[PDB]
Amino acid sequence: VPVSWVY
Amino acid sequence: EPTSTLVRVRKSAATLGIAIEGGANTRQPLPRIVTIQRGGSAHNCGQLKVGHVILEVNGQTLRGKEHKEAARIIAEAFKTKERDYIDFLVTEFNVML
Numbered sequence: 001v002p003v004s005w006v007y
Numbered sequence: 008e009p010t011s012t013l014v015r016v017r018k019s020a021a022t023l024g025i026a027i028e029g030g031a032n033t034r035q036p037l038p039r040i041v042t043i044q045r046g047g048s049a050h051n052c053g054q055l056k057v058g059h060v061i062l063e064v065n066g067q068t069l070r071g072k073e074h075k076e077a078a079r080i081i082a083e084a085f086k087t088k089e090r091d092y093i094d095f096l097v098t099e100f101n102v103m104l
Contacts, residue, residue: 002030
């Protein structure tokens with residue numbers, strides 16, 4: 001499952 | 008029929024600062040908040056929680072949006088000059104709209 005930051 | 012809450016995040020800092028997992032075509036088919044950047048707008052809002060699943064951004068469903076596209080929509084919502092806030096429709100559970 002992909003995970004990333006939204007800054 | 009999910010149990011949901013509409014959370015307004017005001018742009019109180021220069022960053023939004025949420026880490027999201029999942030998206031369409033995964034076993035977590037809507038983005039789920041996994042951590043929150045200390046000192047960013049989401050942190051200052053106080054009402055976004057780890058575990059919150061994002062059903063809608065400013066009324067726009069995230070259903071069917073793969074991870075990168077959901078992240079793009081959320082980034083655009085934070086950057087827009089249309090308004091000084093984002094409305095997230097969120098849920099603590101695994102029921103979708």
